[PDB]
């Protein structure tokens, strides 16, 4: 007789259509609830009491405008547990108070933990090095910095991103108007890692596809590859000459190439997360002090930097009353910043 | 609008500034201007750059 | 004498070029913020 | 432009310290047998 632990291990690690593992016990329920909570809220649940918005298919929103919205600002950073002191076990009230926001965010966080544990668990069983798990630390750093740390630095969960297509767009535009987030060099490194990653994805796929060896008679060339073949399916030597002559440099080491493909977009996302930790605290790259000194003293001095600040000032004044309803802002028409005519 | 480093910009604020709205889509090579001074005022470098770049 | 844990260190030419590009580019990016 | 006075030294060390680190390592790699 072997022990119960070992017997459970066998059963968890059976080769099946959907691998389970010990990681599966955390992953599956948290992932399923995050996803089901989003589908439930966007289909049926309002944001009238937290934001004064309609947010579900039931109320008439479409796939672009539905969301599970954050709780009201007066909730602070309450966990907002179903059985907690705000909802007191009342499911209907819980929904109305934004309890599904924290439900989705916390189950989503535990689910991401479970997914990366899955990546380690499978890598170990199959006998590979766990670089895929390591790469997944980027999406984690992003989710944690943006959905958790950022609102924890601010007044409340209200200012986290709400889970929806249009809601996220709103989160972008808020970040431009309030934080001048485009000016932030940690964001800029994120952009370079994402666009550089997409560049590498396209250029590498295209290069292999255009330096293939003729290994078949088909004009459709996909069949002329066998997974167990020992030989390279495309010519590294020819690819290298091409890029050396076109661009001036080229990869010559395939291991370096593939490592660099991990490095670029993972590093970029990590840089962007560091910037958002700063924004949690309003510690922005908002201004260039020297620009401000000059512009204040010299009314003929103008740059694209000073122009963008005028846009931000417009965004804040025009959006804040409806976007921040707990502030009870009333901005008389006469105080609103506007240029001529418009 | 000041775009260049020597006229008060840094790397993040600097730019080559697009050609004047008074020009519109009119072709504004160097030889259409009465002088380099005019050409610079009206954003001639932008058109020379972008047309040679898109062709290249 | 003789510590057997010693190992030579290396940095190939390509790595030098990559590292210098990283440094210079970071400097070109961050310098505006340092001057402020 | 009234820039920060430490901006120059900060930028200069930011470039030079790691760059020289790399140069040191490169040259002593070439001089190996």
């Amino acid at each position: 007789e072997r022990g119960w632990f070992d017997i459970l291990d066998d059963w968890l690690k059976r080769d099946r259509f959907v691998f389970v593992g010990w990681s599966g016990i955390l992953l599956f329920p948290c992932a399923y609830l995050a996803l089901g909570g989003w589908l439930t809220g966007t289909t049926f649940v309002t944001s009238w009491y937290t934001h004064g918005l309609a947010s579900s298919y039931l109320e008439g929103c479409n796939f672009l405008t539905v969301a599970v919205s954050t709780p009201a600002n007066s909730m602070g950073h309450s966990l907002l547990l179903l059985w907690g002191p705000e909802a007191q076990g009342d499911f209907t009230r819980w929904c109305q108070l934004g309890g599904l926001w924290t439900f989705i965010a916390l189950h989503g966080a535990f689910g991401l933990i479970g997914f990366m544990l899955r990546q380690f668990e499978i890598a170990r069983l199959v006998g590979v090095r766990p670089y895929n798990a390591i790469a997944f630390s980027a999406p984690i750093a992003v989710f944690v910095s943006v959905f958790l740390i950022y609102p924890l630095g601010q007044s409340s969960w209200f200012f986290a991103p709400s889970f929806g297509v249009a809601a996220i767009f709103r989160f972008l535009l808020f970040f431009q108007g309030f934080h001048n987030w485009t000016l932030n060099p940690f964001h800029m490194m994120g952009v370079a890692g994402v666009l550089g990653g997409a560049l590498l994805c396209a250029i590498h796929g295209a290069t292999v596809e255009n330096t293939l060896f003729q290994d078949g008679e088909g004009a459709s060339t996909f069949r002329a590859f066998n997974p167990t073949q020992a030989e390279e399916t495309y010519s590294m030597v020819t690819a290298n000459r091409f890029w050396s002559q076109i661009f001036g440099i080229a990869f010559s080491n395939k291991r370096w190439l593939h490592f660099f493909m991990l490095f670029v977009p993972v590093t970029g996302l990590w840089m962007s997360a560091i910037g958002v930790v700063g924004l949690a605290l309003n510690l922005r790259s908002y201004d260039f002090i020297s620009q401000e000194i000059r512009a204040a003293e010299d009314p003929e001095f103008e740059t694209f930097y000073t122009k963008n600040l005028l846009l931000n000032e417009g965004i804040r004044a025009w959006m804040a009353p409806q976007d921040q309803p707990h502030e009870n802002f009333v901005f008389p028409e006469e105080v609103l910043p506007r240029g001529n005519a418009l | 609008v000041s775009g260049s480093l020597l006229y008060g910009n840094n790397i993040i604020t600097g730019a080559v500034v697009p050609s004047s709205n008074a020009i519109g889509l009119h072709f504004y090579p160097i030889w259409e201007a009465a002088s380099l001074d005019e050409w610079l005022y009206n954003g001639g470098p932008y058109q020379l750059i972008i047309f040679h770049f898109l062709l290249g | 004498e003789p510590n057997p844990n010693r190992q030579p260190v290396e940095l190939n030419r390509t790595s030098l070029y990559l590292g210098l590009l990283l440094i210079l580019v970071l400097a070109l990016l961050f310098s505006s913020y340092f001057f402020n | 432009m009234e820039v920060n006075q430490l901006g120059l030294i900060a930028t200069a060390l930011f470039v030079l310290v790691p760059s020289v680190f790399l140069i040191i390592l490169y040259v002593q790699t070439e001089s190996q047998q």
Partner: peptide
């Protein structure tokens, strides 16, 4: 000072491009 600094870094990057291209480690097939 700032303009000289930004131009100097740029010029170094352009020089690095020249060495990385024409004084590269040659790819060796053997």
């Amino acid at each position: 000072m700032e303009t000289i600094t930004y131009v100097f870094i740029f010029a170094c990057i352009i020089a690095l491009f020249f060495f990385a291209i024409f004084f590269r480690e040659p790819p060796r097939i053997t």
